[PDB]
Amino acid sequence: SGEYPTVNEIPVGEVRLYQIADGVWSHIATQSFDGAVYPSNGLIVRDGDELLLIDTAWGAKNTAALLAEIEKQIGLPVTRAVSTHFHDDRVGGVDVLRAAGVATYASPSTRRLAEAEGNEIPTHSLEGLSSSGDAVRFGPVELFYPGAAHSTDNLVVYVPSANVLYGGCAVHELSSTSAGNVADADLAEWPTSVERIQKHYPEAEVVIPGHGLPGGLDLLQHTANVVKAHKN
Ligand SMILES: C[C@@H](c1cccc2c(-c3c[nH]c(=O)c(F)c3)c(C(=O)O)[nH]c12)N1C[C@]2(C[C@@H](CN)C2)OC1=O
Ligand SMILES: [Zn+2]
Ligand SMILES: [Zn+2]
């Protein structure tokens, strides 16, 4: 009923959208992994009379449900998708997207890692993102590579029309007491990568984490704090 959704308010097998700003939504879905249930976020950005999707809904069936929810709530076609790193919460569902006619994109680093790991593989490579601090435009967003953090390939996404910063899994929600799943992380570099984000997007008004509730710029400092303390 207007609050940011959570696992407790998304019916089983479902996806919910949340309006962030004019022409900007997050998508929220839930998935099981190693016997626990987790929410995860993605982004939808209006691109004229089309939509740009950022990240899958963490699985084939969740991603089909995402497309159906988008058709219900927005009614514009998803023409392109970008996955912000190689984990299943970002690429699981790329096969569904591609069979629905969505053109799927990721960095070459993400594509290589996804292939090696046995995850679904976006079709198209995003060049120009291989060095930390790199940025490229992609429709209504800017894609930024901050350096290694949650993963070595993680991208962030900025929507300049709305000053919305989608941090993906390199950014954690304010209630987070832990640095999440750090299996593929670089804890030593992560605070330096967050500092790059802070420096590049000082006018961000909304910050959206890869899992959990959006907030403001404080998510970035909080993330740095939690990662340093986890490593400590
Ligand atoms: C798919 C993704 C994943 C699975 C389950 C939970 C999480 C969390 C998370 C946890 N706990 C939180 O409290 C939180 F808010 C977020 C995150 C995140 O933190 O982004 N990602 C998760 N995978 C799996 C795996 C690839 C590696 C096997 N080779 C292990 O790593 C990875 O991230
Ligand atoms: Zn991940
Ligand atoms: Zn994640």
Domains, the chain, with CATH or none: 7-231 (3.60.15.10)
Give the containing element (helix H, strand E) for 97.
helix 94-99
Name residue, tokens 């309006």.
Answer: 19
Containing H/E element for 94?
helix 94-99
**Hey, how many other C-beta atoms are within 10 angstroms of the C-beta on 200?**
16
> How does DSSP classify residue 4?
P
For this entry, resolution in Å reads 1.2
Cite the DSSP H helix spans in 123-206.
190-200
Buried b (16+ CB within 10 A) or exposed e, 210-228: bbbbbbebebbebbbbbbe
> Which 3 state secondary structure label does DSSP give 148?
coil
Q: Are strands 164-168 and 24-33 parallel, antiparallel or unpaired?
A: unpaired
Q: Is the CB of 226 under 6 A from ligand 1?
A: no
For ligand 1, atom 30: residue with the closest CA: 183
CA distance 106 to 44: 16
Closest residue by Cα to atom 13, ligand 1, is: 180
Selection from 115, 225, 114, 232 nearest residue 176 by Cα: 225
Long-range contacts of 30-37 (CB under 8 A, 24+ apart): 30/58, 30/62, 31/58, 31/59, 31/62, 31/88, 31/89, 33/88, 37/7
Centre of ligand 3 to C-alpha 21, Å, is 23
Cβ of 6 closer than 6 Å to ligand 1, yes or no, is no
